[PDB]
Amino acid sequence: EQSLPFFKLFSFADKFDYLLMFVGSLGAIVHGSSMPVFFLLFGQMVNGFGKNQMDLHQMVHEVSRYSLYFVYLGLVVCFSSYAEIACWMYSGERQVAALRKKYLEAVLKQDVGFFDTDARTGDIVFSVSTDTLLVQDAISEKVGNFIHYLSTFLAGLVVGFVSAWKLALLSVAVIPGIAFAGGLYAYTLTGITSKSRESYANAGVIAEQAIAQVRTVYSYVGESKALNAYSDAIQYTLKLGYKAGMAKGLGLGCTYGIACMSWALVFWYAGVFIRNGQTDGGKAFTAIFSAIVGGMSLGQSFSNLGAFSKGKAAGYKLMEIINQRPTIIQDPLDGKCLDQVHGNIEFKDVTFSYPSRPDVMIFRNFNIFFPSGKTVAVVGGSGSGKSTVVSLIERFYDPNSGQILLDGVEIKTLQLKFLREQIGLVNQEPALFATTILENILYGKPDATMVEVEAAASAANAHSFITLLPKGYDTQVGERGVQLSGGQKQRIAIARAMLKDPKILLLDEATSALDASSESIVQEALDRVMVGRTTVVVAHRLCTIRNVDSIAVIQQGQVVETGTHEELIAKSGAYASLIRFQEMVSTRLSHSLSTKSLSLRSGSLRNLSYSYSTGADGRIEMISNAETDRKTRAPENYFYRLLKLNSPEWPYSIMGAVGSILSGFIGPTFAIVMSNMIEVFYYTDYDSMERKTKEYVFIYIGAGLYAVGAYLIQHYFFSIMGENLTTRVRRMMLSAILRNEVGWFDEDEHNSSLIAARLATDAADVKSAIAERISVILQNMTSLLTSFIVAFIVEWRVSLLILGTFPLLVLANFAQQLSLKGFAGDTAKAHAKTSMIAGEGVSNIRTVAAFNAQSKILSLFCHELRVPQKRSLYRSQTSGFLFGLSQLALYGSEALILWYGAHLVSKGVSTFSKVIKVFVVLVITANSVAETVSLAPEIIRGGEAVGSVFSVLDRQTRIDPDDADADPVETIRGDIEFRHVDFAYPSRPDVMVFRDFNLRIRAGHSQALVGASGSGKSSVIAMIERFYDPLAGKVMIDGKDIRRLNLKSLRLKIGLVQQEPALFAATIFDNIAYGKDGATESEVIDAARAANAHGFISGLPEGYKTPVGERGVQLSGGQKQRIAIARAVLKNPTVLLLDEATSALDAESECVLQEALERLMRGRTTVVVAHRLSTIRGVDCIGVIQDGRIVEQGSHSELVSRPEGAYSRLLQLQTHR
């Protein structure tokens, strides 16, 4: 939407952060203008190094002096790279840790009705969690990289032009010839990747329907031809992935062919400007190098502007809640405070609707009255706003038309520390904050004593169960060490509402846990506190309502009838039907936040975002998302396994490993030709400096064509090898997902949106683990290897001191590559315990608003942000100092090589152009050896988070769909029998609805297992075919054990009809032929005319063909059911399995099954399940299931001849319309 300016992000800065930024921006400039000053000190050295070739005593003076200037330079990079990291990492924290402390003083004071779950309480939690890490990343340390590399651009054009100005206008005019083709590569490379994401979305729904509809894919045995349609929609992404590698070889070959055809330019006119008597070799070495690293260093300053715009986007979403003004606030001076309350709450002509949406009407002309010291029961028959009255006495909402008065005093003239203090609240699923179980009791009263805490939990059935825990009333209720994790939480929350002693006592519908004898223990606990209190009882079910002494019932906007439970039960006026209605009878945020986290982290790395889960039943768990270090490593023998899978392509690596050694030879060849022209620049024969600088230019032309035909080989090959590996893995993963049991798909983190992404991204970076980490190892170990053979043949007494100095040159060139991406490191991990305290004080705000606990959540927040600051005080003084010390050894150890270089020449041993060739080669080599030691952990350390796709390859399924040691099935006659069998759902193993079930179904008959009010009715058809396994006992079919038979040989003559039918993304000719392999045209027309939709299939535009899955014509719920019954009649099964539940038919003028009851049940053994007692006339037998057993069985002529049984209770439900 909108955005702030870049300033006003620096508006929480106190009078101490205007001092850490003044110092911290003199560190960023003096460290900036010290690489173009290095090119002036090293430039003036060579003037004295080789000018003085005839006087070997002036050499020792003018190199011993300029070597001392490197140590004086290294001590100004020592104390100025320390002052841009120890003053921007720490002063970017004290400004953002005062943004968190005022954003939470804003969302504790807004009106409580601002949060009604409508992507609102799932948005304030996300804004405090991630949007305060984007304002931190924008102002903390990437401002130091914006000043650093900009000042090199402004001081690379001042050292350059002052030395020799006719060479700082050639070298500047080169850079738009390199950056032209250096960005045309980066344009066309994106122009093919976007043709790959579009070429994959054809197969992004084929591996999406085959998992979300897995019950149908296993029922009709067609889990093989979801692999002959997924394989051929990857072959059009492989072939598009080949010419996205050729456009990487011709995008790096035409950059070393413009770079190495441009050093020949600036080194030719240096050979002219010296022959005219204008410059020398130390004023043409300064002008060229200072104006290129000055010109190349704008590509790093403008890399920070991507992060300075998210900090203006996320900066405005925070700064429109901090300065938002709410209505219902506390007036400490313009607000009264009474005494000796009585509690006669009265609603006097109040009308109200929700201010989120004023469409519906809730309390149109509403009038109820509350006595003093009595109980009422405000109850509706439906959602008539019966749960709204507790949200209005608390003044969570003002009544927009009406008045509410306490003892003849309107509540709009009282302060919100005296009104909310007198009312207690006990609600749905009572909120306990993840602290000790002693501090939760002290929310109802902050400080009285210890002995009243024990007396409060005494008369609440709580004094014992918090002593049967092996500590002194102290248990971390979030960290599930010793769990009071029953469905009956031992209700300490009722003990909160007793210690507070509220006069008005709002109770709520706190019987919503499938009540039993456990919920009757807390029932008398509520019955013993309700004395002398003006209390209400809001109830949803009238089972425990039997002793309430003045009940009032509302239906629509007002109360219908009042009185005690002698005259309310009388007269049958709108109460007898409601008690008849009694006789006829979170985890949403974490799924919502992860979808907001999905497709929003494509640029933010794994050190800044989170990954939201459900955790325990205390908090909302926030994983720091830097779990790639110490969570779920790969198998240790993976790198040999991923080479065994990728070995029919051996001739595409031998053509690439003898094509990646040839690119290691552009490392010495750049540094030998360039370090021979410093020699040539100091001749004194001006027609032998000419015909030797012609040879050193034709090599630059002849090595800008060697770099074209040695990157087309390195990157085209090793992309034939890298795309026949992310094609064989994706086919070996779908063929191993579609083999498991059905219960693995039932789990929440294995749904069909976290499993079609593991085939799109997590299996697409096996290319970047065994093909992009052998190319940059064979290259970098033949550039390290042939530049330590040149350096020893030329001169070996200097290149043995560099070899002892070489761990220090490769360390200083390694710390200059961590600094490009910040030294902060995993900044979402320290601010994780802090964020959950803001996370639990937003979603539990209806318990923070009562008890006046809006200052103790803030004092668990300012007392705890002290730890992630003193973590970021030691990390910013160590990382700032060790970076400022490793740079002292880069400049301070080139002073030792060059001084010892002038100790061997002056004693007659060496010469010039043998000390420089040893120096130039072994420093440019050390710049790319510290790239090999940067990808060195990620090979050993478990690969990475995408090299661990072996959980889907190596996972032994509980049910094996095919065997060799199992006899197949020839012909089923139908002998369905359940022996002594119990069963539980493996998703939630506490559900135990099956207890020793038994049936016996004879061939050529039917079965009519009734609904019985949803007592686990939809699991008999989930065991005739093995979608699950029983816990004990045998399932007998056709006289044989079912776990001894070939599963694919059995399912091709047992066909179900789905509860909720959905179709595949194809025509209506495949979706009616998917259930029969081989038949084409003859019996497909007539089987379409069985759930006769023939005018529906003749009246259709393109004959039979029409898209019905997606992006075509849309069908109704009554017409999609007609398609699924056309499948089963073409398959012609032996055991039919119908399923009807939760009134999902919805087909008025019912003729889709009036035809199908008598046509599809001719010789088929059917098992019908339906909750409706209509169109269920099983002509053979009928049964009733209760508690995992049958209670009554037989045909429908002896079940009705018996007087009651249990079927007569179901017979009442026909008149219960």
Ligand SMILES: CC(C)[C@H](C)[C@@H](O)[C@H](O)[C@@H](C)[C@H]1CC[C@H]2[C@@H]3COC(=O)[C@H]4C[C@H](O)[C@H](O)C[C@]4(C)[C@H]3CC[C@]12C
């Ligand atoms: C005086 C130098 C020899 C100095 C000691 C040396 O440390 C220097 O800082 C090195 C690391 C730099 C100076 C100039 C740089 C080059 C200047 O920019 C270029 O022309 C590019 C072209 C291309 O991008 C190459 O891959 C790197 C290459 C060719 C750069 C590679 C590294 C350098 C050669």
